[PDB]
Design a protein around this ligand. Structure first.
Ligand SMILES: O=C(O)CCS/C(Nc1ccccc1)=C1/C(=O)Nc2ccccc21
Length: 135
């Protein structure tokens, strides 16, 4: 039957980005990767099978995939090639994705708002908002 994470499932396309270069700088992404990753217009494909959530991200820059169970840490290699330890939870309808590496932390929050899936990436005081719509 239904689950609350149902509203995330589907194929989503990036429609706007704000402050992503500055977020990438805060994370430590180098110049060339910032330029190429910032140019990307990813699709994000979200599916659920039992307790396992899969999020794919596909662009001309990189194709990545993670599968995970809520609350259960996993190792992730990010599109910019960080080796992080990640935990994803639901918090009041928001998917909260925390990445830890080298004594640093960044959080990506994903929520449904109207017909959008809004992705907020935060590193210290810097936030980037990336808006996706159904493909
Ligand atoms: O999706 C967006 O438009 C914004 C986030 S891109 C992303 N980081 C990231 C950070 C710096 C440079 C390039 C990419 C992701 C990451 O680190 N883990 C993910 C799992 C699923 C989907 C995306 C990401």
């Amino acid at each position: 039957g239904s689950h609350m994470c149902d509203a995330f499932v589907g194929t989503w396309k990036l429609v706007s980005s704000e402050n992503f270069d500055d977020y990438m700088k805060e994370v430590g992404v180098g110049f060339a990767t910032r330029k190429v990753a910032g140019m990307a217009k990813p699709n994000m494909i979200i599916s659920v099978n039992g307790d396992v959530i899969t999020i794919k991200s596909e662009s001309t820059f990189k194709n990545t995939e993670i599968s995970f169970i809520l609350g259960q840490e996993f190792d992730e290699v990010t599109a910019d090639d960080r080796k992080v330890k990640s935990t994803i939870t639901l918090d009041g309808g928001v998917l909260v994705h925390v990445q830890k590496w080298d004594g640093k932390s960044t959080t990506i929050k994903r929520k449904r708002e109207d017909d959008k899936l809004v992705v907020e990436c935060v590193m210290k005081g810097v936030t980037s908002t990336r808006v996706y719509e159904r493909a």
